[PDB]
CSV table of C-alpha atoms and ligand atoms in Angstrom, one decimal:
chain,number,residue,atom,x,y,z
S,278,UNK,CA,105.9,75.6,171.5
S,279,UNK,CA,108.7,73.7,169.9
S,280,UNK,CA,111.7,73.9,167.5
S,281,UNK,CA,112.5,71.3,164.9
S,282,UNK,CA,115.5,70.8,162.6
S,283,UNK,CA,116.8,68.2,160.2
S,284,UNK,CA,120.0,66.3,159.9
S,285,UNK,CA,123.1,67.4,158.0
S,286,UNK,CA,123.6,65.9,154.6
S,287,UNK,CA,127.3,65.4,153.5
S,288,UNK,CA,127.9,64.7,149.8
S,289,UNK,CA,130.6,63.9,147.3
S,290,UNK,CA,130.3,63.6,143.5
S,291,UNK,CA,132.3,61.2,141.3
S,292,UNK,CA,132.5,60.2,137.7
S,293,UNK,CA,131.0,56.7,137.3
S,294,UNK,CA,132.4,54.1,134.9
S,295,UNK,CA,131.3,50.9,133.2
S,296,UNK,CA,132.0,48.9,136.4
S,297,UNK,CA,130.4,51.2,139.0
S,298,UNK,CA,127.1,49.2,139.4
S,299,UNK,CA,128.9,45.8,139.5
S,300,UNK,CA,131.2,47.2,142.3
S,301,UNK,CA,128.1,48.4,144.2
S,302,UNK,CA,126.5,44.9,143.8
S,303,UNK,CA,129.6,43.1,145.0
S,304,UNK,CA,129.9,45.5,148.0
S,305,UNK,CA,126.4,44.3,149.0
S,306,UNK,CA,124.5,47.5,148.1
S,307,UNK,CA,120.9,47.3,147.1
S,308,UNK,CA,119.1,49.3,144.4
S,309,UNK,CA,116.3,51.0,146.3
S,310,UNK,CA,114.6,52.9,143.5
S,311,UNK,CA,114.8,54.1,140.0
S,312,UNK,CA,113.3,57.4,139.1
S,313,UNK,CA,113.1,60.0,136.3
S,314,UNK,CA,112.5,63.7,136.9
S,315,UNK,CA,112.8,67.2,135.3
S,316,UNK,CA,114.9,69.9,137.0
S,317,UNK,CA,114.4,73.6,135.9
S,318,UNK,CA,116.7,76.3,137.1
S,319,UNK,CA,115.9,80.0,137.2
S,320,UNK,CA,118.0,83.2,137.4
S,321,UNK,CA,118.1,86.8,136.1
S,322,UNK,CA,119.7,87.8,132.8
S,323,UNK,CA,122.7,89.1,134.8
S,324,UNK,CA,123.0,85.8,136.7
S,325,UNK,CA,122.4,87.5,140.1
S,326,UNK,CA,121.5,84.3,141.9
S,327,UNK,CA,124.4,82.1,140.6
S,328,UNK,CA,127.1,84.8,140.9
S,329,UNK,CA,126.3,85.0,144.6
S,330,UNK,CA,126.1,81.1,145.0
S,331,UNK,CA,122.3,80.9,145.1
S,332,UNK,CA,120.6,78.1,143.2
S,333,UNK,CA,116.8,78.2,142.5
S,334,UNK,CA,115.0,75.2,140.9
S,335,UNK,CA,111.7,73.5,140.5
S,336,UNK,CA,112.0,69.8,140.6
S,337,UNK,CA,109.4,67.5,139.2
S,338,UNK,CA,107.5,65.7,141.9
S,339,UNK,CA,109.2,67.8,144.7
S,340,UNK,CA,108.4,71.5,144.1
S,341,UNK,CA,110.6,74.6,144.6
S,342,UNK,CA,114.0,74.5,146.3
S,343,UNK,CA,116.6,77.2,146.9
S,344,UNK,CA,120.2,76.7,148.0
S,345,UNK,CA,122.1,79.5,149.7
S,346,UNK,CA,125.6,79.7,150.8
S,347,UNK,CA,126.4,79.2,154.4
S,348,UNK,CA,129.1,80.9,156.5
S,349,UNK,CA,134.2,71.9,156.4
S,350,UNK,CA,137.1,74.3,155.6
S,351,UNK,CA,138.1,73.1,152.1
S,352,UNK,CA,134.5,72.0,151.2
S,353,UNK,CA,131.3,74.1,150.6
S,354,UNK,CA,128.4,74.7,152.9
S,355,UNK,CA,124.8,75.2,151.9
S,356,UNK,CA,121.4,75.9,153.6
S,357,UNK,CA,118.5,74.3,151.7
S,358,UNK,CA,115.1,76.1,151.7
S,359,UNK,CA,112.0,74.3,150.6
S,360,UNK,CA,109.4,76.4,152.3
S,361,UNK,CA,107.9,78.6,149.5
S,362,UNK,CA,107.4,81.5,151.8
S,363,UNK,CA,111.0,81.4,153.0
S,364,UNK,CA,112.3,81.0,149.4
S,365,UNK,CA,110.3,84.2,148.4
S,366,UNK,CA,111.7,86.2,151.4
S,367,UNK,CA,115.2,85.2,150.5
S,368,UNK,CA,114.7,86.1,146.9
S,369,UNK,CA,113.2,89.5,147.9
S,370,UNK,CA,116.1,90.3,150.2
S,371,UNK,CA,118.6,89.5,147.3
S,372,UNK,CA,116.7,90.9,144.3
S,373,UNK,CA,115.1,93.7,146.3
S,374,UNK,CA,111.5,94.1,145.4
S,375,UNK,CA,110.5,96.3,148.3
S,376,UNK,CA,107.2,96.8,146.7
S,377,UNK,CA,106.7,93.3,145.7
S,378,UNK,CA,104.0,91.6,147.8
S,379,UNK,CA,104.5,87.9,148.7
S,380,UNK,CA,102.9,84.9,147.0
S,381,UNK,CA,104.0,81.5,145.7
S,382,UNK,CA,107.4,81.4,144.2
S,383,UNK,CA,105.9,81.0,140.7
S,384,UNK,CA,103.9,84.2,141.0
S,385,UNK,CA,106.9,86.3,142.0
S,386,UNK,CA,109.1,85.2,139.1
S,387,UNK,CA,108.1,87.9,136.5
S,388,UNK,CA,108.2,90.6,139.2
S,389,UNK,CA,111.8,89.6,140.0
S,390,UNK,CA,112.9,89.2,136.3
S,391,UNK,CA,113.6,85.5,137.0
S,392,UNK,CA,113.7,83.3,133.9
S,393,UNK,CA,114.4,79.7,133.1
S,394,UNK,CA,118.2,79.3,132.5
S,395,UNK,CA,118.4,75.5,132.2
S,396,UNK,CA,116.0,72.5,132.1
S,397,UNK,CA,116.9,68.8,131.8
S,398,UNK,CA,115.6,65.3,132.7
S,399,UNK,CA,117.6,63.0,135.0
S,400,UNK,CA,117.2,59.2,135.2
S,401,UNK,CA,118.4,58.1,138.6
S,402,UNK,CA,119.3,54.9,140.3
S,403,UNK,CA,119.5,55.2,144.0
S,404,UNK,CA,121.5,52.6,146.0
S,405,UNK,CA,121.9,52.0,149.7
S,406,UNK,CA,125.1,50.6,151.2
S,407,UNK,CA,125.7,49.3,154.8
S,408,UNK,CA,129.3,49.0,155.8
S,409,UNK,CA,130.6,46.7,158.6
S,410,UNK,CA,127.1,51.9,160.4
S,411,UNK,CA,124.1,53.8,159.0
S,412,UNK,CA,123.6,53.1,155.2
S,413,UNK,CA,125.2,55.5,152.8
S,414,UNK,CA,123.2,56.5,149.8
S,415,UNK,CA,124.7,56.4,146.3
S,416,UNK,CA,122.7,58.3,143.6
S,417,UNK,CA,123.8,57.4,140.0
S,418,UNK,CA,122.4,60.2,137.7
S,419,UNK,CA,122.2,60.2,133.9
S,420,UNK,CA,121.1,63.5,132.4
S,421,UNK,CA,119.3,63.4,129.1
S,422,UNK,CA,121.8,65.9,127.5
S,423,UNK,CA,124.5,63.2,127.9
S,424,UNK,CA,126.3,63.4,131.2
S,425,UNK,CA,126.6,60.9,134.1
S,426,UNK,CA,127.5,61.7,137.7
S,427,UNK,CA,127.4,59.7,140.8
S,428,UNK,CA,127.2,61.0,144.4
S,429,UNK,CA,127.8,59.4,147.8
S,430,UNK,CA,125.6,60.9,150.6
S,431,UNK,CA,125.8,60.4,154.4
S,432,UNK,CA,123.6,61.9,157.1
S,433,UNK,CA,125.0,63.2,160.5
S,434,UNK,CA,123.6,65.0,163.6
S,435,UNK,CA,126.2,67.6,164.5
S,436,UNK,CA,128.6,69.8,162.6
S,437,UNK,CA,131.5,68.2,164.5
S,438,UNK,CA,130.8,64.9,162.6
S,439,UNK,CA,131.1,66.5,159.2
S,440,UNK,CA,134.9,66.2,158.7
S,441,UNK,CA,135.1,62.5,159.3
S,442,UNK,CA,132.0,61.8,157.3
S,443,UNK,CA,133.5,63.8,154.3
S,444,UNK,CA,136.7,61.7,154.4
S,445,UNK,CA,134.7,58.5,154.5
S,446,UNK,CA,132.6,59.4,151.5
S,447,UNK,CA,135.5,60.8,149.5
S,448,UNK,CA,137.3,57.4,150.1
S,449,UNK,CA,134.2,55.4,149.1
S,450,UNK,CA,133.7,57.7,146.0
S,451,UNK,CA,137.2,56.9,144.9
S,452,UNK,CA,136.5,53.1,144.8
S,453,UNK,CA,133.3,53.6,142.8
S,454,UNK,CA,134.4,56.1,140.2
S,455,UNK,CA,137.1,56.8,137.6
S,456,UNK,CA,140.4,58.0,139.1
S,457,UNK,CA,140.4,61.8,139.6
S,458,UNK,CA,142.0,64.6,141.6
S,459,UNK,CA,138.9,66.8,141.9
S,460,UNK,CA,135.2,66.3,142.6
S,461,UNK,CA,133.1,65.5,139.5
S,462,UNK,CA,131.0,68.6,138.3
S,463,UNK,CA,127.3,69.1,139.0
S,464,UNK,CA,124.9,68.4,136.1
S,465,UNK,CA,123.9,72.1,135.9
S,466,UNK,CA,127.5,73.3,135.6
S,467,UNK,CA,128.1,70.8,132.7
S,468,UNK,CA,124.9,72.0,131.1
S,469,UNK,CA,126.0,75.7,131.4
S,470,UNK,CA,129.4,75.0,130.1
S,471,UNK,CA,128.2,73.2,127.0
S,472,UNK,CA,125.1,75.1,126.2
S,473,UNK,CA,125.4,78.6,127.8
S,474,UNK,CA,129.1,79.1,127.6
S,475,UNK,CA,128.9,82.9,127.9
S,476,UNK,CA,127.1,82.5,131.3
S,477,UNK,CA,129.6,79.8,132.3
S,478,UNK,CA,132.4,82.2,131.5
S,479,UNK,CA,130.9,84.9,133.8
S,480,UNK,CA,130.7,82.2,136.6
S,481,UNK,CA,134.3,81.1,136.0
S,482,UNK,CA,135.5,84.8,136.1
S,483,UNK,CA,133.8,85.5,139.5
S,484,UNK,CA,135.2,82.5,141.4
S,485,UNK,CA,139.0,82.9,140.9
R,261,LIG,C1,132.5,74.2,140.7
R,261,LIG,C2,131.2,74.4,141.4
R,261,LIG,N1,130.5,73.4,141.9
R,261,LIG,C3,129.4,73.6,142.6
R,261,LIG,C4,128.9,74.8,142.8
R,261,LIG,C5,127.6,75.0,143.6
R,261,LIG,N2,126.5,74.5,142.7
R,261,LIG,C6,126.6,74.4,141.4
R,261,LIG,S1,125.2,73.8,140.6
R,261,LIG,C7,124.4,73.7,142.2
R,261,LIG,C8,123.0,73.2,142.1
R,261,LIG,C9,123.0,71.8,141.6
R,261,LIG,O1,123.3,71.0,142.7
R,261,LIG,P1,123.4,69.4,142.5
R,261,LIG,O2,124.4,69.1,143.6
R,261,LIG,O3,123.8,69.0,141.1
R,261,LIG,O4,121.9,68.9,142.8
R,261,LIG,P2,121.4,67.4,142.5
R,261,LIG,O5,120.8,67.4,141.1
R,261,LIG,O6,122.5,66.5,142.7
R,261,LIG,O7,120.2,67.3,143.5
R,261,LIG,C10,125.3,74.2,143.2
R,261,LIG,C11,124.9,74.2,144.7
R,261,LIG,C12,129.7,76.0,142.3
R,261,LIG,N3,129.3,77.2,142.4
R,261,LIG,N4,130.8,75.7,141.6
R,262,LIG,MG1,120.1,61.9,147.2
R,263,LIG,MG1,122.5,64.4,146.5
């Protein structure tokens, strides 16, 4: 037999500005693709998934994905699950349907009292940047509800490499975006804050 795993993705969000694309161009980045896609997130009425740092979505053209917290000191760690059967097992453990019998994620939604909590369309430009060695990716996202966020992404092999990669992408992010102390918010968090502010408040309360 054999075991297989992926690389580690390291990421940092930033607020783009009017000059972000021009900076990318002058740095020698190339625009690899432009794409538009719907994201739809799901949770229970009590926000069971989100309150425990679990994030379940169906992404147009990609299928189901679930993000779970992992056990970078100042920065978050996530395990991404895209196997439907592993998503469903994780959801059963957390939301406890002992009786529930497995199936595709879609089929188990009702049984788990999972409902759509947010849906929106993102228009994305994805750029690649080689410096002096593997190309960084820069995703520039525009959400149809009216919010723009960029993100710099690097891949690395071992967890030992994560701290240096983080510093690099933080520094690159700062040259591409508006000055800021903290990381720019995720599209979903801005959506929740503006359009589901009672839910946002629950999330705020939990984290402090
Ligand atoms: C302040 C804050 N930021 C981030 C998180 C974690 N989080 C919020 S929404 C989300 C899912 C959306 O992730 P995103 O990075 O926007 O996915 P993308 O659309 O870029 O693929 C996660 C993991 C949190 N709990 N609190
Ligand atoms: Mg990306
Ligand atoms: Mg990303």
